[PDB]
Write a protein that binds this ligand. Sequence first.
Ligand SMILES: Cc1ccc2nc(-c3ccc(N(C)C)cc3)sc2c1
Ligand SMILES: Cc1ccc2nc(-c3ccc(N(C)C)cc3)sc2c1
Ligand SMILES: Cc1ccc2nc(-c3ccc(N(C)C)cc3)sc2c1
Ligand SMILES: Cc1ccc2nc(-c3ccc(N(C)C)cc3)sc2c1
Ligand SMILES: Cc1ccc2nc(-c3ccc(N(C)C)cc3)sc2c1
Ligand SMILES: Cc1ccc2nc(-c3ccc(N(C)C)cc3)sc2c1
Ligand SMILES: Cc1ccc2nc(-c3ccc(N(C)C)cc3)sc2c1
Ligand SMILES: Cc1ccc2nc(-c3ccc(N(C)C)cc3)sc2c1
Ligand SMILES: Cc1ccc2nc(-c3ccc(N(C)C)cc3)sc2c1
Ligand SMILES: Cc1ccc2nc(-c3ccc(N(C)C)cc3)sc2c1
Lengths: 55, 55, 55, 55, 55, 55, 55, 55, 55, 55
Amino acid sequence: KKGVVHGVATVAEKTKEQVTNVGGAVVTGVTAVAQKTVEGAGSIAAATGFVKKDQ
Amino acid sequence: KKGVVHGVATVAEKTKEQVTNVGGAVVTGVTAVAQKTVEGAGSIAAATGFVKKDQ
Amino acid sequence: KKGVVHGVATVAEKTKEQVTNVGGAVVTGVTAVAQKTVEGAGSIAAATGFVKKDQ
Amino acid sequence: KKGVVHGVATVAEKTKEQVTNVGGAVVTGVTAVAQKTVEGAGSIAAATGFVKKDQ
Amino acid sequence: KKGVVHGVATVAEKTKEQVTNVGGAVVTGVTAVAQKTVEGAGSIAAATGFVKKDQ
Amino acid sequence: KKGVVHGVATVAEKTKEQVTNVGGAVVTGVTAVAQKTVEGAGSIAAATGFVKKDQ
Amino acid sequence: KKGVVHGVATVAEKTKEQVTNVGGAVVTGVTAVAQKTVEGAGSIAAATGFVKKDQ
Amino acid sequence: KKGVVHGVATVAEKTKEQVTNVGGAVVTGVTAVAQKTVEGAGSIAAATGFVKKDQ
Amino acid sequence: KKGVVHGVATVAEKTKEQVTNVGGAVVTGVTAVAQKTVEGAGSIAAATGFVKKDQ
Amino acid sequence: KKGVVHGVATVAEKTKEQVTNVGGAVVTGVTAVAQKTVEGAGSIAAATGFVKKDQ
Ligand SMILES: Cc1ccc2nc(-c3ccc(N(C)C)cc3)sc2c1
Ligand SMILES: Cc1ccc2nc(-c3ccc(N(C)C)cc3)sc2c1
Ligand SMILES: Cc1ccc2nc(-c3ccc(N(C)C)cc3)sc2c1
Ligand SMILES: Cc1ccc2nc(-c3ccc(N(C)C)cc3)sc2c1
Ligand SMILES: Cc1ccc2nc(-c3ccc(N(C)C)cc3)sc2c1
Ligand SMILES: Cc1ccc2nc(-c3ccc(N(C)C)cc3)sc2c1
Ligand SMILES: Cc1ccc2nc(-c3ccc(N(C)C)cc3)sc2c1
Ligand SMILES: Cc1ccc2nc(-c3ccc(N(C)C)cc3)sc2c1
Ligand SMILES: Cc1ccc2nc(-c3ccc(N(C)C)cc3)sc2c1
Ligand SMILES: Cc1ccc2nc(-c3ccc(N(C)C)cc3)sc2c1
C-alpha cells in the first residue's frame, strides 16, 4: 500500500476508536465528576483535558 | 509499503485506540473525580492532562 | 518497507494503543481522584500530567 | 527496510503501547489519588508527571 | 536496514511499550498515591517524575 | 445532665453531621463512580456501603 | 438538661445535617454516576448504600 | 453527668461527625471509583465497606 | 460521672469523629479506587473493609 | 468516676477518633488503590481489612 499525508491524518484498519483533533476539544470517554463546593478566584477545580494559552 | 508524512500522522493496522492531537485537548479515557471542597486563589485542584502557557 | 517523516509521527503495526500529541493534552487512561479538602493559594493538589510555562 | 526521520518519531512493529509527545502532557496510565487535606501556599501535593518552567 | 534520525527518535521492533517525549510530561505507568495531610509553604509532598526550572 | 436511651440514639451538641440508621441505607457523602463496562453473572462491580443477607 | 428516648432518636444543637432512618433509604449527599454498559444476570453495577435481605 | 444505655448509643459533645448503624449501610465519606472493565462470574471488583452473609 | 452500658456504646467528649456499628457497613473515610481490568471467577479485586461469612 | 460495661464499649475523653464495631466492616481511613489488571480464579488482589469465614 501507499500513503502520503500532510497532517494531521489518522489512518488505520480494524480499529475500535479514532480521534483526530486540531483545535479545540474532543471528549469521547467516560467521565464522572462529583463535587460539593468550589470557591476561590480562580481555581481550576477538576480539569481532565485542558489547555490555557491566554495572551 | 510506502509512507511519507509531514506530521502529525498516526498510521497503523489492527489498532484498538488512536488519538491525534494538535492543540488542544482530547479526553478518551475513563475518569472519576470525587471532591468535597475547593478553596484558595488559585489552586489547580485535580488536573489530569493539563497545559498552561499564559503570556 | 520505506518511511520518511518530518515529525511528529507514530507508525506501527498490530498496536493496541496510540497517542500523538503536539500541544496540549491527551488523557486516555484510567484515573480516579478522591479528595476531601483543598486550600491554599495556590497549591497544585493532584496533578497527573502537567505542564506550566507561564511567562 | 529504510527510515529517515526529523523527530520526533516513534516507529515500531507488534507494539502494545505508543506515546509521542511534544508539549504538553499525555496521560495513558492507571492512576489513583486518594487525599484528605491539602493546605499551604503553595505546595505541589501529589504530582506524577510534572514540568514547571515559569519565567 | 538503514536509519538516519535527527532526534528524538525511538525505533524498534516487537516492542511492548514506547514513550517519546520532548517537553513536557508523559504518564503511562501504574501509580497510587494515598495521602492524609499536606501542609507547609511550599513542600513537594509526593513527586514521581518532576522537573522544576523556574527563572 | 441526664440521659437514658434504649437505642439506637445519637445525642450530641455542636455537631456538624449526624446519621442514625436501623435498616436500611443512608447516603450522605460525596460519591463519584465512573465506569465503562460491567459484565459477568453476577459481580458486585463498585460497592461502597453494602450488606447482603440472602436466605 | 434531661432526655429519655426509646429510639431511634437524634438529638442535637448547632447541627448542620441530620438523618434519622428506620427502613428504608435516605439519600442526602452529592452523587455522580457515569456509566457506559451494564450486562450480566445479575450484577450490582454501582451501589452506594445498599441492603439486600431476600428470603 | 449520668448516662445509661442499652445500645447502640453514640453520646458526645463538640463532635464533628457521628454515625450510628444497626443493619445495614451508611456512607458519609468521600469516595471516587474509576473503572474500565469488569468481567468474571462473580468477582467483587471494588468494595469499600462490605458484608456478605448469604445462607 | 457515671455510666452503665449494655453495648455497643461509644461515649466521649470533644471528639472529632465517631462510628458505631453492628452489622453491617459504615464508610466515612476518603477512598479512591482506580482500576483498569477485572477478570476471573471470582476474585475480590480491591477490598477495603470486608467481611464474608457465607454458609 | 464509675463505669460498668457489658461490651463492646469505647469510653473516652478528648478523643480525636473512635470506632466501635461488631460485625461487619468500618472504613474511616484514607485509602488509595491503583490497579491495572486482575486475573485468576480467585485471587484476593488488594485487601486492606478483610475477614473470610466461609462454611
Ligand atoms: C495515507 C497514507 C498511507 C500510508 C502511509 N504510510 C506512511 C508510512 C509508511 C511507512 C513509513 N516508514 C517510516 C517505514 C513511514 C510512513 S505515511 C502514509 C499515509
Ligand atoms: C486560571 C488560572 C489562574 C491562576 C493559575 N495559577 C496556577 C498556578 C500558580 C502557581 C503554581 N505553582 C506551581 C506554584 C502553579 C499553578 S494555574 C492557574 C490557572
Ligand atoms: C495555533 C497553532 C499555531 C501554530 C501551530 N504549529 C504547530 C506546529 C508547527 C510545526 C510542527 N512540526 C511537526 C515541525 C508541528 C506543529 S501546531 C500549532 C497550533
Ligand atoms: C504553538 C506552537 C508553536 C510552535 C510549535 N512548534 C512545534 C515544533 C517545532 C519543531 C518541531 N520539530 C519536530 C523539530 C516540533 C514541534 S510544536 C508548536 C506549537
Ligand atoms: C511551542 C514550541 C516552539 C518550538 C518548539 N520546538 C520544538 C523542537 C525543536 C527542535 C527539535 N529537535 C528534535 C531538534 C525538537 C523540538 S518543540 C516546540 C514547541
Ligand atoms: C431526649 C434526650 C435528651 C437527653 C438525653 N441524654 C441522654 C444521655 C446523657 C448522658 C448519658 N451518659 C451515658 C452519661 C447517656 C444518655 S439520652 C437522652 C435523650
Ligand atoms: C443480586 C445478587 C445476585 C448474586 C450476588 N452474588 C454476590 C456474590 C457472589 C459471590 C461472592 N464472592 C465473595 C465469591 C460475592 C458476592 S452479590 C449478589 C447480588
Ligand atoms: C426489620 C427489623 C426487624 C427487627 C429489627 N431489630 C432491630 C434491633 C433489635 C434489637 C436492638 N438492640 C439495640 C438490642 C437493635 C435493633 S433493628 C430491626 C429491623
Ligand atoms: C434484623 C435484625 C435482627 C436482630 C438484630 N439484633 C440486633 C442486636 C441484638 C442485640 C444487640 N446487643 C447490643 C446485645 C445488638 C443488636 S441488630 C438486629 C437486626
Ligand atoms: C441480626 C443480628 C442478630 C443478633 C445480633 N446479636 C448481636 C449481639 C449480641 C450480643 C452482643 N454483646 C455485646 C454481648 C452484641 C451483639 S448483633 C446481632 C445482629
